Design an enzyme around this catalytic site. Sequence first.
Site, short mmCIF file in Angstrom:
data_model
loop_
_atom_site.label_atom_id
_atom_site.label_comp_id
_atom_site.label_asym_id
_atom_site.label_seq_id
_atom_site.Cartn_x
_atom_site.Cartn_y
_atom_site.Cartn_z
N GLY D 39 36.14 -34.48 25.85
CA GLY D 39 35.29 -33.27 25.90
C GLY D 39 35.52 -32.42 27.13
O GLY D 39 34.68 -31.53 27.39
N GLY D 40 36.60 -32.67 27.87
CA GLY D 40 36.91 -31.83 29.05
C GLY D 40 37.11 -30.38 28.62
O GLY D 40 37.50 -30.11 27.49
N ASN D 48 45.02 -33.43 22.96
CA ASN D 48 44.42 -34.72 23.42
C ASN D 48 45.30 -35.86 22.91
O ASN D 48 45.48 -36.85 23.66
CB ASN D 48 42.96 -34.83 22.98
CG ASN D 48 42.24 -36.10 23.39
OD1 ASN D 48 41.49 -36.13 24.36
ND2 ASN D 48 42.41 -37.17 22.61
N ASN D 107 38.14 -40.95 22.35
CA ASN D 107 38.11 -41.09 23.82
C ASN D 107 36.95 -40.28 24.38
O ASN D 107 36.65 -39.15 23.89
CB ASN D 107 39.41 -40.76 24.55
CG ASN D 107 40.00 -39.42 24.21
OD1 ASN D 107 40.30 -39.15 23.05
ND2 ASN D 107 40.23 -38.59 25.23
N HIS D 263 41.36 -42.00 33.08
CA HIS D 263 40.45 -41.67 31.97
C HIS D 263 41.18 -41.22 30.70
O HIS D 263 40.50 -41.05 29.66
CB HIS D 263 39.49 -40.61 32.49
CG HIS D 263 38.41 -40.19 31.56
ND1 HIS D 263 37.47 -41.08 31.08
CD2 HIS D 263 38.09 -38.97 31.08
CE1 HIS D 263 36.62 -40.41 30.31
NE2 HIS D 263 36.96 -39.10 30.33
P1 LIG Z 1 34.85 -37.20 28.43
O1 LIG Z 1 35.90 -36.85 29.45
O2 LIG Z 1 34.88 -36.40 27.16
O3 LIG Z 1 33.39 -37.20 29.06
C1 LIG Z 1 33.11 -36.28 30.16
C2 LIG Z 1 31.62 -36.12 30.27
C3 LIG Z 1 31.01 -35.47 29.06
C4 LIG Z 1 29.53 -35.23 29.22
C5 LIG Z 1 29.18 -34.41 30.44
C6 LIG Z 1 27.72 -34.12 30.60
C7 LIG Z 1 27.34 -33.64 31.98
C8 LIG Z 1 28.25 -32.56 32.53
C9 LIG Z 1 28.32 -31.33 31.68
C10 LIG Z 1 28.67 -30.05 32.40
C11 LIG Z 1 28.53 -28.85 31.51
#
Ligand SMILES: *P(=O)(O)OCCCCCCCCCCC
Lengths: 284, 284, 284, 284
Positions: D39-40, D48, D107, D263
């Site tokens: 979700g980056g 991805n 992931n 990650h």
């Molecule tokens: P993966 O690398 O997909 O998970 C990363 C964190 C996803 C959830 C983040 C929630 C808090 C930060 C959001 C900022 C808009």
Amino acid sequence: LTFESTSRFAEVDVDGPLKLHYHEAGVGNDQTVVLLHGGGPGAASWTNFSRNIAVLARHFHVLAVDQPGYGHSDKRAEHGQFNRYAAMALKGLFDQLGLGRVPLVGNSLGGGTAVRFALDYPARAGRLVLMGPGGLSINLFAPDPTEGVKRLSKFSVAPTRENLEAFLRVMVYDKNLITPELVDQRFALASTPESLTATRAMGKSFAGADFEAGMMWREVYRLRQPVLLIWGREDRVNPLDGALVALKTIPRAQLHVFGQCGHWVQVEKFDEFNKLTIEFLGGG
Amino acid sequence: LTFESTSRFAEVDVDGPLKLHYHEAGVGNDQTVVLLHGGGPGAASWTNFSRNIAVLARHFHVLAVDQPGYGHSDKRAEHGQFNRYAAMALKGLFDQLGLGRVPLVGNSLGGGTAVRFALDYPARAGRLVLMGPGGLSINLFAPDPTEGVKRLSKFSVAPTRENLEAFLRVMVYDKNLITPELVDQRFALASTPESLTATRAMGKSFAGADFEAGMMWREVYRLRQPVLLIWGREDRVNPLDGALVALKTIPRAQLHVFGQCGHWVQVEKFDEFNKLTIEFLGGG
Amino acid sequence: LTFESTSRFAEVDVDGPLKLHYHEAGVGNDQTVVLLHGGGPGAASWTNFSRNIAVLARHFHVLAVDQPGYGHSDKRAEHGQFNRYAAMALKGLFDQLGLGRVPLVGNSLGGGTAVRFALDYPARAGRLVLMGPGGLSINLFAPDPTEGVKRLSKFSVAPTRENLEAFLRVMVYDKNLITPELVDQRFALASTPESLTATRAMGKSFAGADFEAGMMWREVYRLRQPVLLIWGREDRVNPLDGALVALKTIPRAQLHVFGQCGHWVQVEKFDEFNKLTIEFLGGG
Amino acid sequence: LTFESTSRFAEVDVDGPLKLHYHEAGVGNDQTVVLLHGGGPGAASWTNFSRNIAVLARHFHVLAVDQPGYGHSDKRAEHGQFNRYAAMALKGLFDQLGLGRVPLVGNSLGGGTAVRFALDYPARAGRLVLMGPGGLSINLFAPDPTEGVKRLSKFSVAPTRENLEAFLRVMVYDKNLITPELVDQRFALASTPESLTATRAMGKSFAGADFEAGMMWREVYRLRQPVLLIWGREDRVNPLDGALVALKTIPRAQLHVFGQCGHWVQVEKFDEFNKLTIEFLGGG
Ligand SMILES: *P(=O)(O)OCCCCCCCCCCC
Ligand SMILES: *P(=O)(O)OCCCCCCCCCCC
Ligand SMILES: *P(=O)(O)OCCCCCCCCCCC
Ligand SMILES: *P(=O)(O)OCCCCCCCCCCC
């Protein structure tokens, strides 16, 4: 008690003359205790232990020692593994002052120094109180370097007020403790040529070939005394997973973890820390 | 203070009349505290907390409650999930005695009951002190059932003096605490038809369809009060890895671990336990 | 491939002549791999790796070595720290067979031997596959001795079929693997005077001035090769918490954990283990 | 196989019409597998899984789904808890394509979506492969928010190329994977008003009355399928300590940890990841 009223100097021999600065309080109390501060830029005994010395000095004869490279102690451009260097300095002071077996209280780098001293000179160290300690910590889960260590390295490379404030904000759970006045005071001390020399000297030594002396998680099964490990749950410098090898392997270990507390246990939980330390070291 | 001098009974309503036995001491101290004992066969309030009630009664109004199925409390042949059953019994007692918000001290099964009570009746529970607690523990590394739980189950199936001694030896670090007199006393209590009925009733309920009420590690993020988790490093019933979810998720959690201490913290480290409890609950 | 067709002997010099028994298969294949079995009473190469040797011999030149004190290798009554003793014997075999750098696969005590070999003769050890290994494991949460080790110690003191079956039952998740036939076979080998003498000598060899040689979690940060740690989640001899220091400190470590799997990964998850090992050692 | 040749659209009903973009490959193959990306900012299915889709499509009928808010799927400004939202969209696609029970690979945020799907529609989810997953992770040691999450939050507030590169650098062990080309491509997609609106909406959706839906470590004890957890030892977003509750509580769990891996397991260890996934999902 003031910085000035408690201020003392000693000259010891560690590969030549070494001036140590320390604070003394509670003279005539039966039990001496030595305090060893953390290693953040601009750190020193009085500012590290301001919420503690006055209270501990009611029960103990307190010696709060500026480690070599910090405060008004000598800031050499070169030295070996920092904890063995500092432990040799402390052995020099113990001998000069005629101390026998003394309990040690150490946060972070100072905890590492307390442990190195207790291992190398076992008859001279009593009970240990170690707060978010370096050296005997090994972060089994946290990738190294931690967020906290990275911000310390960034300051070392770019010694700016902004980079010092950034490192101080990951020291504490309550970021409101990092006042503009604290930042100003620490930056003034940390950014002197002599202090930057000591931080340059420090850089080499942990990465040098002397590194094994720093891996005290390998050695603490040898400690015979009671050891009280104290951690902030939210420590972002030396995180809580770093407590586990020491808790397992030190025979008379205890651990206390404070929720809603970062890397400065002695500041963020000063009353609970003071009470644990007084009881653990025997009430004095 | 004696068993007899402190002995009290109340009748409460939990799916009908339920007689609770408890011990009262320190009447007139400003702060009431409730003690909830562990669930080993033959366990009860007075024997579980013998090294603690006299000391705590100097500071607090102590109510040490025999949980349903134990001591002189009713030993029904059937009940729901044990911690919710016991929590409903305690709610009945709180209401009968006119208690408002009261701190709870609970070891093992009693810690589970304290937590279930604090979750279900949040306005009625104050600070918690939980020693090797069940319910909010989840053993992230230890295979279940643990050595300790296996010996408890073996006694339940074959309620012999040999099997009770075996279970008691994995409760403590210093196996010399398990005297022939302790074994004799516990076996006499544990092997009565009524006690074996309660241990048969207990068997079903943790394995029953009501099991989710027991998985309190899923719920304790809801606790708003300070909670002091206390563990013996050598606990072989509810091992130390069971502390981690509760320490992470309870906002105002603290953890204290004692080296050279098993599952009976309140006995094996009675002085340190008493002092932690008195300070944590506010000195009274 | 049979026990008899693969059977080989060597005589090596380890503080005097030492007979080693081993099984050789896949003589056509370029990549040599050494297999080191677990140390339970009556263990040996062929039985420990019965679900693995044929599959691995399709890809690799397999040398499955009966460690000193086991199978058809010499069973001396006196020797030093066991893993260093067994590693010295293996080193003797490496030199006799003209081996250079060779990967090692070892479960439990055999894992300890593989690690001691890789630390003492670092140029001779390639990739390591270590299943529920001793030596580099330190149980950060589990009280020592573990349930599994206690059952091995009980058999050593009281070598009955009942005590052997009890130890074998805590080595697997699926207790149905512990057939009457397996118990009868293991007990007939374990109960010989020569085997019991070896079992007791191996136990005593872990406690003395050089106990440091057994604390390999202090040393594996120096291993430069890829290391695949494999654990059963339900291992009750060397539990999963024992993996953490090795996983953190070995630069090229990997960990695989199988749920619903105890201490005999190579048996309980034989197909998954075989495939992991073939891929990790480069397919052959 | 190209982005264009594999590109597909569906319209599903999720509190109104919702356009979903996905990539389809291996249409000949019997075993369907759904891939859910991280979700980056600027993430999507094709980028991805660029090192995985071709290899997996040799064995499986691959459906790589752009989650709502990403790639060419609809980017609503308002929605509920993200993983439940994304799971409802996937459920809509399952029903449209006439899928029964299908394994899922996810992931980070996609891992969270896969788990929420497997909990909400349990009969529709087969085996799970979850790489550094959100949702079922709870960081028992790491203070939250982690370094990784803090850098994502900083980008959300200040969406600059410098803040995107900083976030991407803490997602990998080998920082050389974060090429100028990768940063330029991800930032051009991340910086669009539609993408930033989605990123902020996804962040806000994790905090509110139904935050319980995000705490999937409370629920995964109910998963009946084999689950392969895959972690990079150096994951600084969802660190390794986040694996422990899932590994303990999912009955048929496995864990694989790669040293020298952050990650993005599917990128950093693409060959090992591909082989683990092919074997775990039954070879196809
Ligand atoms: P993966 O690398 O997909 O998970 C990363 C964190 C996803 C959830 C983040 C929630 C808090 C930060 C959001 C900022 C808009
Ligand atoms: P405590 O806060 O004293 O420990 C902080 C970390 C000490 C170790 C620092 C390693 C990197 C040093 C960089 C020098 C600029
Ligand atoms: P504390 O010592 O009270 O906790 C001991 C374990 C409680 C849970 C017992 C589960 C198995 C019960 C078997 C009944 C015979
Ligand atoms: P693996 O199953 O080979 O490891 C089991 C433990 C091996 C070491 C045991 C030492 C203490 C008990 C020895 C009793 C003679």
